Ligand binder design. Sequence first.
Ligand SMILES: N#Cc1ccc(O)cc1F
Ligand SMILES: N#Cc1ccc(O)cc1F
Lengths: 308, 298, 307
Amino acid sequence: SVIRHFLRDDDLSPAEQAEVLELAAELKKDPVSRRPLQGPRGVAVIFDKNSTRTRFSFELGIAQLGGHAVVVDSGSTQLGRDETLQDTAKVLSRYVDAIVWRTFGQERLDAMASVATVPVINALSDEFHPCQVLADLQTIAERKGALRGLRLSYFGDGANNMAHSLLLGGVTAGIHVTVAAPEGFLPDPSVRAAAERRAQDTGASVTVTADAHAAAAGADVLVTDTWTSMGQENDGLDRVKPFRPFQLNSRLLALADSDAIVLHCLPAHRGDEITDAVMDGPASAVWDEAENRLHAQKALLVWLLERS
Amino acid sequence: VIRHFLRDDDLSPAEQAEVLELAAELKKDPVSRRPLQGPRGVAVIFDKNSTRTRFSFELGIAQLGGHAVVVDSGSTQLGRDETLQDTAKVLSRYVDAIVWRTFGQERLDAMASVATVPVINALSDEFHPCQVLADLQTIAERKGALRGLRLSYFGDGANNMAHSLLLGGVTAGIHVTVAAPEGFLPDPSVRAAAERRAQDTGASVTVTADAHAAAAGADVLVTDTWTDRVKPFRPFQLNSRLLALADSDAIVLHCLPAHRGDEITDAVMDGPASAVWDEAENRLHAQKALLVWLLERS
Amino acid sequence: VIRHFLRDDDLSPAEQAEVLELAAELKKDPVSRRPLQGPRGVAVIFDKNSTRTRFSFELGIAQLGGHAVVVDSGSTQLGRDETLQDTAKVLSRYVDAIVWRTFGQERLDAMASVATVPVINALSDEFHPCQVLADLQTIAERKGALRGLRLSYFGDGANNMAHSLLLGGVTAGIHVTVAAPEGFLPDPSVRAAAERRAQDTGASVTVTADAHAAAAGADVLVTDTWTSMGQENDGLDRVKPFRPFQLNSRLLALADSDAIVLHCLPAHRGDEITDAVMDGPASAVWDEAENRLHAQKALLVWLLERS
Ligand SMILES: N#Cc1ccc(O)cc1F
Ligand SMILES: N#Cc1ccc(O)cc1F
């Protein structure tokens, strides 16, 4: 069989993504009913940078599939230094049945996936966060039912990992995705083109605008994220002033549909991209969204393992 | 409705007895209780690493059928925009209990008020209540009934072990004495809490600088690392001459690591009064019992 | 009556054969032996980290039904806060075996002198006996019976792999040659122990500076990194003495036509071994790495039932 990887959201077709999201709902109801890793079989979980959500959701998810996660903080290792990534991938493929990797550049994930003989999963990278968007889609479906035709708007830095993955994963689900971002902070052009092409297949659409109020009007789902990642703290830009009109506050939420929901990949900076009132209010689905990392990632692993 | 265990008197006398009974049952049948079968998760977070805390909790949780997600001190520093409150809310969606080794009690109190799962103090600046559960299990299996025994702690009377031996000890009905020099005495609100709890159990609290008087007639003698900056503590060294003053069949306890030659001697710690190895083992059984008990009440 | 595995000759020839047979059985049926069901614990302690040692032991212990408790070098090093003897007595109350990667051999001896459970050397300055069990399992699955094979190791002749290939190799009846430059020769006590064990098994020990001779007629060619992290600041040029001992296509071509190549990871391609050799048809390095899992599981099963 072809070995399947999941490095970006569009690695699943629309039909394949629907299968994974249905499995995520099934596993949330019956969390130990799928045991493909019984043995236990191993799964590598490798962190170039720590993440509470990523650590807990993957380590426990793998265990609940019957497996054993070998969790590596690569700062305590000589990854990239003492041997080639190609050599590392070949050795890993002898010990584990899948490789879960939180890293920075997408080309490293690509390299690992081209030589590993087991599925490689992007746990979080500079360019994409496709596991978070699977959890987001599960959360939206839980609240709203069918994803096809919903309107989702994302606010803030339009070129970070969540903007890119909401574009790709959202249109794969048939969602009309709007990115509201200031000029200079727009989605990567190749990602945007990929999302526009995928949107043709599902009847979705891609909109990019600097008009935050227009983006909010009529939306079913409002999303934001931190305006700055760790790598961008030293990029030289004022990363507050451009984004202030894009804050997800009560005024913005009130422009959306009356039962709109709010998502935010953690962590959050209350007072910057989102306010206390919204973050902690009745429209917020942030905690269910975090919990669904566990269920959605389990579903993804089950699906990749059986196809690989 | 969620119970926490952040200091020894979070358990009433009757609840402490239940936990200690369960610890004895679990020591006999270590995989007979599987409340975390699945596995269900438990967070084990170290703001400062502790190898023996990691072994006892990580294996104990596994023997309850669960899976401990262990976060070492390197991984415990919160990145940009992370917060303790948001951490507690997220952990409550992934795990069934939170075990935390941290410093100030204020952090534990905050985690407990936000989390919707039980929070356990694995070890903190002010208290080490899981060690004292293991200590009480050790005393009980060697001496039977805890009520009315005399226990003396020697050395730094201001540290977490002194506070927990006071609170956990009087909760079990034990007459507790702390022998310590004047700059190193129990925190006064802990002392007053221990004196109050002792009225309910028939116990008592004594604080003295007289190590001789503290040892005389003692049934249990306890010490801990003292950390010259250590001169005030030398008169409190738990040595062979101090042990000679205790009741017959007295037992010696020491939460590890021991620095032989300082707070305790080779002769006392390798001698027939020593229970320090059984004590260390009982961290496993007592903490498993505590977890079983908290989970069933939460 | 508690058995430890601190160096390769802690197993007799017959005992080593039992462990290697079990490694082959466990490779076939990896969850058929559950001596640690419960789970029972096993300590896996690193004074210096080894992620590859971590993968193989953590998963191997789990597949025996147990739970590995892993301690990395980010905690207070064992022996600093309390005696190693006190540490062994406490660990013995929590776990059924102690797996430890440390530095000098005296530390392993100290822990094993007191522990009431088996102590296993995961990797040390002087020996790497678990890697050589994996190597012997690999050689056996590629070549059959080990007795009488000719194995040559090239490079730093006084490191842990050179010492363990000597001891573990002659225990299996393999004729072992170490090809190394002057100043980098096997420890004399290890060589003498290997020579004595070789008299029981029909094996032999050869130490030579002639790489061509070492390679000629060899069934197995082995190398390792020329320098450990601890050696980077020892003051020596640790490249120029070893260039004649590079395991390259020229050198491989002198060996038997069916020769295989081993290298415990990681490899520094272009130094001790070339890309052509690493990635060519004689290389068994990836099976070798996999067999760390199986050989260490067999060792654990065997030690637990003897203790
Ligand atoms: N995982 C990560 C992490 C860091 C700090 C903390 O207090 C808790 C955690 F789960
Ligand atoms: N870092 C991570 C990691 C995982 C497996 C391995 O063989 C080496 C590594 F550095």
